[PDB]
Design a protein around this ligand. Structure first.
Ligand SMILES: [Mg+2]
Ligand SMILES: [Zn+2]
Ligand SMILES: [Zn+2]
Lengths: 98, 70, 104, 240, 421, 48, 145, 344, 303
DNA sequence: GTGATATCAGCCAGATCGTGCGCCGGGCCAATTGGCTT
DNA sequence: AAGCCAATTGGCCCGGCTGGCTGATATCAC
């Protein structure tokens, strides 16, 4: 991932990899006793924002060809209520197989 | 073929038995006997719709007593 | 793929637990002889009045007092506006003229 | 004119209330006996009509059902989770087309109550009652009588009946045949080295089909310490 | 053929090796496309037919080892040839093979075929050598079992080569076997799959050929835009008049003598007339032969028992004509079991036994007039079935396969029987 | 038996779980116990 | 619970008593969800007092929020504390101001109402849809006298 | 349809509002027109997401005659008589290329020489023959005029003095029936053979030796081939590869004659003859609708001279200007240990 | 008689039987209404007049009621005209007509003839008000209050006018400046007015599915997660067993493992009969004990 | 633990005037009329 | 001239626009 959290051009991805890093806030929630006890053990304070990053689906591979990013604050004509958009292109060469 | 148990599991604990899917997963993971199937959710949805149509659908036990499906 | 969620939440709490906080049953009755009991937490303020969702009528406690509540604002009718706009003598003379024409 | 001249000696009514009154004061056994006598003595098309009528007259005569059940005073309401209001990503809400019909019923019923307790000419009350009955009819069966109601895009709404009938109803699509777990699909090639009782699965499909079993097995052999590490190990696709 | 179905009197005198000219290729595209479209539609037609067949006979399962019945069907083997020497009948593999003998066969005081045997080619060859032409075999049509059918009447299970077990679902097997070759049957009178659909639905054929009712003399009447055949029986009863159209091709001349069920015109007999005039056995034979003709035309082999299951399912009810005092309204179809038991109860402490007539009905009507409202609702016409059951307050006992499948419990067949569990 | 060609056809795989389902799939539905055809009794699992 | 005990499936003609015995409460308003907080509106089609809580072991106002408070009707809002899955099992009902016919027993040929009352379908349709009157009673003896 | 609502609104507001303060700008509301245009171009059964497997697929998606859609008919209501190959389709609609699913007969392809009339009918060209002499006058004829005349066959042996030889020529008559006739009644002749076959069906060598079903399958299956990284034109093809590839619009063609000035895998700048310079850009590893790759090669060199219409860059599945959907492989016909058993 | 499948036509043909009215007729009808109402009130008063006076009083009351009914039946046509003016956008024609009828009833209730003005305009005001209120309160599945509906309508009108005059889609800043509100408010108002889609909308050409058949249930119990949580609970109970009885007990009663009820330090000390700070000391010791590089690895994975 | 003030939501009213929504096949039932029957 | 026994045809259904006034809520503060 590069400075703004978008995969680098030329990187090779495999199933489960992260293409774009995204964080979504979730607000106040109550954890189960076991989870709270485990957090107390390891002392990992909750961040209150979960991850919704974009990952390659199962059974997909290939290099990264292009990354196109649109910002609603850069004059792009994004639809209402869409701050930012990003598109990532993955290409792979297939040989003939049974 | 005459295979009743395979059909019953293909219809209950693989599609609709909401409380049975987790139980069967736990049974497989812990290495023990698969539990008996329950009653599928689609039947309950059908009964609810039929009752919503002002039809008095009810299931009876050996004696003429309703079960009420929870 | 399409992702959508109903505005619902789920919890891992076992619900088998080890003990439940004590509750008290308060009894109510209907005007047609239908009766029921409602469970409330002991640390609670009992409401003197309830709605029997079994029969859809107002219900009071077995031994509670019977309160009286008046209308916050009575539903305005035609007659109220007629006093508001027309004077008493105007209505009196209108009625007199109407009675005269009816008699004639 | 007849009412103001001969108001007494008879009671008249209009709408479903008249049918309810007639069904309440109905002598079923007398009608059944009359139909039986006509069948025995009379002949012709009258005999066939009486035979057809006795089938529906006799049912209520003996069984626990009563005719008054054909007219409704209160209408049941299906649980909300069977008519969900789901929130799609982006704020768009998706409904189930039964909320609209229920809302029509409730709105028209409330307006009817307002008109009745307010005092209105018979024309308005009768029109409101007709609209309420049509709303209930559309709720139960849509398009059976008159023209079906439509939403955006001018396509008929789905009613309670439509969910049980047809090739896409509850009975045929969700009950007699369903989707199942632990299932895979793929294109077949030919292997002539196999025996008559053998098949060849690709290892991706086999691994995804047998995931719990392999997790338990590799936990057993100490290839992992717990089911969490076993699941991560299977997902990452190691060698062992 | 042309775009319309009619031969073009100019052939394609060139094979695919020598190459076709432009016009010949264009002419061939006609038949090519027509065949492709017929192939496209046959799939849906056969699927619908098989669904109906499965629905009518889902609950026909084996539930006994032997009913002890002494009855059966007289099946013919070893049709006599033109040389005076018995020759085995052509269709013995699908008529008498995999079937049992109702009664022992004795010729010249020798038992050459004991009762209740598989009746393979060895026994048939021995019987033909001994010089017999008829055998009284056991069929489901004549099973006296109280519950369902029994293994000995069904006979051998063709899928395994041994006696059918006591939990087999023979009805579904019969439905599937009859319905599978539907796509192979390439679609005045119906010829292909529509002919089978017509036969199993007990419909009136297209080219209806009236069949005489009483033996006697026949006379023909001539009039414009009409023809009539009047039959005077030898018994002297009233005349019988059959009207027909001008185009109809006659088969019996004026003053000729006719049999009880002899045809009086070229066409297709309708099952109802043959039933009413010659009993249940005649209609059974007619239906089996007519159904097997369509399949044999395309070289499809299906055993007779599979069709016999459907046929017996189609003849399960009797229509009441005489009121009697059995509480059965006239004109109300009733299962023969209910009618028989009601008559038995009435004859005791009663005077009038109700009388009825056999009724032949199609697979759709038979499968919709069932005793379980759940299966009927799940078949088709859901709204009508439900609004009828609600008024009748019908109670479903869950004794079939579809009901148990719907509610999610062990089907009462195969390994789900309490005998094995 | 499957009426399956090798010009792009696809097939589905299901996994029995319980002991009863496995016993049925192993004793009743096995591939090498189904030589004959239920319709008429002629073999279908035959060199073609 | 156990399908092995299902003995029969009986269908009947539901009456008002059955309809309002199934219901856990009467829905008397047409609102579904608040446009801002997205929470069910009271007495609406999605109310929680009638159809159950929307969150496991939690009431509408939030006074009770734990599994310990199980099976307690929060006096503040009336919602009980239990699993949200009960929203798939609880029915409500609407009390009509005037009676209504069931379309199934009116239109489905043969019209069962017509056969039972011996009324032609056109006459019955006229009566129910407020197009003509209907004499439901008459004093034969008194009028003759 | 949009303008109908627009003018209804215009007249209503003109009547309702005042006068002497009204101008055309404040009477015309163009919302309905744009709304109708948007509705048509989106969620309409005739505005289809394009097919971009290869140049042939794109070219065949155009030239497609669909008999179903808004105002047409339905898939399940069409009978067995509207899907037939009526004898009036000769030269106007292909009888081979149609879908094999439940759409058989309801979608077709325009023939190679077909043309659309002013009223929407389809015309086809015929060479006029007078007094048994095949002239060089081409007349475009519709179905009715074709029924009026008697049409000869494309491959009719001639004496080479523009005159028929055998005196017994197979010709089509009023009802589409074929018959032998003398060389005096004939009045029209086909312009060429393969006048009745579509563009995709004209690229199957030895088509006259193939059953109609197999030719139909081959035509429907040539539209699914994917473009490979290295293209190679067929060794034994038809004469219709270059024309199809160039007319499909996926081959870069010079606009004006000139000499290539500078060249690179991304661009070609040519100095036209009239003094102006023009630079052409090439797609490299783009993406088509179907997920394949669009990539254009260069077939010219720096010193070459190019005339207008010359091909300067290949396409996704072309090789030097002509369609190339596959590769030439050395094939042997024999069974081999059962690995090629039953169509493998 | 002759009920049709189009109730609108039947209602329209039924409301035309009664004729219209004139200004003098309306004035005298209002006079009759007022006289009847006043006479009915006077009768309702306790004092009792002569029987004949009460009889004529009832007669005039009946006449006034009939006059009111006639007036409403006459103005039904005006109600229908306003309704058809407001037709569309959410409500059916008959619903609008009924709301207009209620508004007309209110207008007749709140009407005075002293002004001498034609009764039509007052009823028009009231009918329009009632129809607008009802439409704002019943035209959406997710109800929006009247003021927010007004804001949404004004924003839509301004946006349409800007699009027409300018010829280009207005950017949010332009609308914010013209409407005199922040861009965030404009965005929120835009997001409020959207109408929901249906789960039964077909999406495939064949029609084998609906739009609601691919909506993933994002609030169900994933069996893998449930079994993982159960294994975590078992492992936690096993690990807490290795500790001493006192330490495990204090941890359990501090995090409420057994009952789910967290407890304060003082209560724990009370049950243990020790100081609050001492109890706090024990919790820290156990917390560090579990977070050690000798017992952590049995619990690291589950975190 | 309160406490002031802004929005948040629901309800009510105005007067000139204004008066009519915007494909096929198969099975069955019911209305009509020819032709008897009295 | 009234009533009934049939045929005939038509139809239906089912299978593939400001404004004012008041109490409750919240949101920042003490
Ligand atoms: Mg294949
Ligand atoms: Zn038997
Ligand atoms: Zn609460």
């Amino acid at each position: 991932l590069d400075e703004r959290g978008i995969i680098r051009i030329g990187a090779e991805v495999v199933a489960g990899d992260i293409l774009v890093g995204k964080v979504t806030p979730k607000g106040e929630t109550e954890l189960t006793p076991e989870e709270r006890l485990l957090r107390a053990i390891f002392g990992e304070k909750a961040r209150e924002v979960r991850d919704t990053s974009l990952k390659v689906p199962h059974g997909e591979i290939g290099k990264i060809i292009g990354v196109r990013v649109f910002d609603r604050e850069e004059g792009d004509e994004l639809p209402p209520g869409v701050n930012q958009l990003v598109r990532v292109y993955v290409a792979q060469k297939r040989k003939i197989t049974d | 073929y005459g295979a009743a148990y395979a059909l019953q599991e293909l219809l209950t604990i693989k599609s609709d038995d909401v409380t049975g899917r987790v139980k069967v997963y736990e049974a497989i993971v812990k290495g023990e006997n698969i539990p008996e199937p329950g009653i599928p959710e689609s039947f309950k949805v059908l009964i609810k719709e039929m009752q919503s149509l002002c039809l008095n659908v009810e299931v009876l036990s050996s004696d003429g007593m309703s079960i009420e499906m929870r | 793929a399409l992702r959508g969620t109903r505005l619902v939440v789920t919890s891992y709490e076992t619900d088998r637990g080890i003990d439940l906080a004590p509750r008290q049953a308060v009894e109510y009755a209907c005007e047609k002889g239908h009766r029921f009991e409602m469970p409330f937490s002991v640390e609670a303020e009992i409401p003197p009045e309830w709605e029997c969702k079994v029969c859809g009528i107002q219900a009071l406690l077995v031994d509670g007092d019977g309160p009286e509540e008046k209308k916050g604002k009575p539903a305005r009718t035609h007659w109220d506006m007629l006093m508001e706009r027309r004077t008493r003598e105007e209505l009196e003379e209108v009625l007199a003229e109407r009675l005269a024409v009816l008699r004639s | 004119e007849l009412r103001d001249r001969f108001g007494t000696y008879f009671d008249g009514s209009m709408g479903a209330a008249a049918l309810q009154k007639r069904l309440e004061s109905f002598d079923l056994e007398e009608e059944a006996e009359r139909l039986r006598e006509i069948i025995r003595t009379g002949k012709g098309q009258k005999k066939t009509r009486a035979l057809k009528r006795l089938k529906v007259v006799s049912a209520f005569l003996q069984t626990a059902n009563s005719p008054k059940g054909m007219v409704l005073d209160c209408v049941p309401v299906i649980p909300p989770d069977l008519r969900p209001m789901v929130q799609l990503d982006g704020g768009r809400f998706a409904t189930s087309d039964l909320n609209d019909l229920y809302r029509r019923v409730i709105n028209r019923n409330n307006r009817l109550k307002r008109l009745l307790d307010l005092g209105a000419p018979e024309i308005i009350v009768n029109n409101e009652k007709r609209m309420l009955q049509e709303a209930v009819d559309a709720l139960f069966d849509n398009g059976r009588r008159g023209r079906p109601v439509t939403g955006p895009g001018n396509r008929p709404l789905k009613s309670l009946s439509d969910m049980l009938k047809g090739k896409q109803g509850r009975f045929r699509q969700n009950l007699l045949g369903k989707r199942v777990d632990y299932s895979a699909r793929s294109v077949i090639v030919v292997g002539p080295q196999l025996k008559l009782h053998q098949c060849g699965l690709p290892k991706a499909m086999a691994l995804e089909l047998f995931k719990p079993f392999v997790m338990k097995r590799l936990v057993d052999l100490n290839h992992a310490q717990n089911i969490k590490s076993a699941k991560r190990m299977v997902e990452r696709g190691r060698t062992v | 053929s042309n775009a319309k179905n009619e031969t073009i009197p100019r052939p394609i005198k060139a094979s695919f090796r020598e190459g076709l000219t432009v016009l010949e290729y264009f002419i061939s595209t006609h038949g090519a496309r027509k065949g492709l479209a017929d192939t496209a539609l046959r799939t849906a037609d056969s699927g619908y037919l098989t669904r109906r067949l499965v629905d009518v006979s889902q609950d026909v399962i084996i539930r006994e080892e032997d009913c002890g019945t002494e009855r059966g069907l007289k099946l013919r083997i070893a049709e006599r040839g033109a040389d005076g020497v018995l020759r085995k009948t052509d269709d013995v593999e699908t008529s008498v093979y995999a079937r049992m003998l109702a009664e022992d066969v004795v010729v010249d005081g020798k038992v050459i075929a004991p009762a209740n045997v598989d009746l393979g080619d060895v026994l048939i060859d021995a019987l033909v050598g001994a010089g017999v032409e008829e055998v009284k075999t056991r069929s489901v049509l004549t099973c006296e079992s109280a519950v369902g059918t029994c293994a000995f009447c069904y006979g051998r299970s063709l899928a395994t080569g041994k006696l059918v077990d006591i939990g087999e679902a023979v009805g579904i097997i019969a439905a599937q076997s009859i319905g599978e070759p539907g796509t192979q049957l390439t679609m005045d009178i119906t010829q292909g799959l529509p002919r089978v659909v017509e036969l199993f639905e007990a419909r009136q054929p297209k080219g209806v050929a009236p069949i005489s009712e009483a033996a006697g003399r026949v006379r023909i009447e001539e009039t414009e835009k009409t023809k009539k055949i009047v039959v005077t029986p030898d018994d002297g009863t009233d005349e019988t008049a059959f009207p027909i159209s001008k185009r109809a091709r006659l088969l019996v001349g004026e003053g000729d003598h006719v049999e009880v069920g002899q045809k009086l015109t070229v066409g297709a007999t309708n099952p109802h007339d043959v039933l009413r005039i010659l009993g249940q056995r005649a209609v059974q034979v007619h239906l089996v032969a007519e159904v097997q003709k369509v399949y044999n035309s395309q070289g499809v082999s299906i055993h007779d028992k599979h069709i016999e299951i459907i046929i017996r399912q189609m003849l399960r009810r009797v229509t009441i004509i005489e009121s009697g005092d059995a509480e059965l309204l006239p004109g109300e179809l009733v299962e023969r079991s209910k009618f028989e038991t009601e008559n038995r109860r009435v004859v005791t402490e009663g005077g009038h036994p109700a009388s009825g007539r056999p009724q032949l009905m199609g697979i759709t009507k038979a499968s919709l007039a069932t005793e379980s409202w759940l299966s009927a609702a799940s078949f088709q016409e859901t709204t009508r079935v439900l609004t009828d059951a609600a008024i009748n307050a019908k109670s479903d006992s869950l004794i079939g396969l579809k009901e148990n499948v719907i509610i999610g419990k062990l089907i009462p067949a195969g390994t789900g029987l309490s005998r094995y569990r | 038996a499957f009426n399956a060609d090798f010009d792009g056809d696809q097939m589905a795989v299901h996994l029995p779980l319980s002991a009863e389902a496995q016993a049925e799939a192993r004793i009743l539905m096995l591939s090498s116990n189904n030589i004959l055809k239920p319709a008429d009794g002629r073999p279908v699992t035959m060199p073609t | 619970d156990d399908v092995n005990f299902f003995d029969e499936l009986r269908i009947g003609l539901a009456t008002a008593d059955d309809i309002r015995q199934w219901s856990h409460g009467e829905v008397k308003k047409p609102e579904t969800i608040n446009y801002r907080t997205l929470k069910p509106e009271k007495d609406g089609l999605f109310c929680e007092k009638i159809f159950g809580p929307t969150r496991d072991w939690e009431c509408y106002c939030g006074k009770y929020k734990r599994v310990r408070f199980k099976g307690i009707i929060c006096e503040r809002c009336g919602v009980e504390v239990t699993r949200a899955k009960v929203r798939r099992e609880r029915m409500g009902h609407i009390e009509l101001a005037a009676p209504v016919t069931h379309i199934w027993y009116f239109k489905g040929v043969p019209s069962r109402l017509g056969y039972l009352l011996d009324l032609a379908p056109k006459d019955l349709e006229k009566v129910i849809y407020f197009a003509a009157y209907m004499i439901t009673y008459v004093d034969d003896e008194r009028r003759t006298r | 349809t949009g303008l109908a609502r627009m003018e209804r609104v215009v007249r209503e507001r003109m009547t309702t509002q005042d006068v002497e303060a009204i101008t055309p700008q404040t009477l015309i509301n163009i919302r309905p027109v744009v709304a109708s245009i948007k509705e048509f171009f989106g969620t309409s059964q005739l505005s289809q997401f394009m097919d971009q497997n290869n140049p042939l697929s794109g070219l065949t998606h155009k030239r497609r005659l669909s008999a179903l859609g808004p105002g047409g008919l339905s898939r399940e209501r069409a009978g067995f008589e509207v899907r037939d190959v009526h004898p009036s389709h000769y030269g106007r609609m292909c009888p081979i290329e149609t879908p094999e699913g439940p759409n058989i007969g309801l979608i077709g392809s325009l023939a190679s020489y077909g043309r659309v009339n002013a009223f929407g009918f389809i015309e086809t060209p015929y060479r006029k023959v007078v007094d048994g002499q095949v002239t060089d006058e081409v007349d475009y004829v519709t179905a009715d005029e074709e029924d009026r005349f008697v049409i000869a066959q494309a491959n009719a042996a001639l004496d080479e003095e523009l005159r028929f030889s055998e005196n017994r020529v197979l010709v089509r008559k009023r009802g589409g029936e074929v018959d032998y006739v003398e060389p005096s009644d004939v009045d029209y002749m086909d312009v060429s053979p393969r006048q009745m076959v579509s563009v995709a069906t004209a690229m199957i060598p030895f088509l006259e030796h193939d059953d109609a079903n197999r030719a139909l399958m081959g035509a429907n299956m040539m539209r699914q081939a994917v473009p490979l990284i290295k293209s190679e034109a067929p060794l034994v093809g038809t004469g219709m590869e270059y024309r199809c590839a160039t007319d499909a619009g996926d081959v870069l063609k010079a606009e004006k004659d000139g000499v290539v000035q500078e060249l690179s895998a991304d661009y070609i700048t040519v100095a036209n003859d009239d003094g102006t310079y023009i630079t052409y850009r090439l797609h490299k590893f783009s993406r088509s609708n179907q997920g394949t790759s669009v990539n254009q090669k260069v077939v010219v060199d720096e010193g070459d001279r190019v005339i207008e219409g010359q091909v300067l860059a290949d396409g996704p599945a072309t090789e030097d200007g002509e369609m190339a959907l596959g590769k030439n492989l050395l094939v042997a016909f024999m069974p081999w240990e059962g690995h090629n058993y039953e169509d493998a | 008689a002759g009920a049709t499948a189009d109730p609108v036509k039947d209602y329209l043909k039924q409301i035309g039987k009664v004729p219209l009215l004139n200004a003098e007729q309306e004035v005298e009808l209002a006079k009759r209404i007022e006289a009847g109402l006043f006479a009915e009130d006077k009768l309702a008063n306790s004092d009792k007049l002569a029987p004949k006076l009460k009889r004529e009083l009832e007669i005039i009351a009946e006449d006034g009621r009939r006059a009111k009914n006639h007036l409403l039946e006459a103005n039904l046509r005006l109600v229908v005209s306003l309704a058809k003016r407001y037709t569309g956008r959410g409500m059916l024609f008959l619903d609008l007509i009924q709301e207009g009828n209620l508004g007309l009833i209110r207008a007749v209730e709140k009407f005075d003839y002293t002004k001498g003005y034609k009764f039509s305009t007052y009823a028009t005001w009231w009918i329009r008000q009632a129809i607008t209120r009802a439409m704002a309160d019943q035209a959406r599945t997710i109800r929006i209050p009247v003021h927010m509906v007004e804001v949404i309508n004004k924003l839509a009108r301004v946006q349409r006018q800007m699009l027409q005059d300018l010829g280009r889609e207005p950017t949010p800043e332009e609308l914010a400046k013209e409407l005199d509100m922040t861009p965030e408010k404009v965005i929120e108002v835009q997001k409020y007015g959207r109408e929901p889609i249906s789960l039964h909308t077909p999406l495939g050409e064949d029609g084998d599915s609906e739009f609601g058949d691919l909506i993933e249930d994002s609030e169900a119990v994933v069996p893998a997660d449930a079994v993982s949580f159960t294994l975590l609970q078992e492992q936690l109970h096993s690990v807490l067993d290795t500790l001493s009885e006192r330490e495990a007990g204090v941890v359990s009663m501090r995090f409420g493992l057994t009952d789910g009820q967290p407890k304060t330090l003082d209560e724990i000390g009370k049950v243990y009969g020790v100081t609050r700070e001492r109890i706090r000391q024990i919790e820290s010791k156990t917390m560090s004990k579990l977070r050690h590089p000798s017992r952590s690895q049995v619990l690291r994975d589950y975190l």
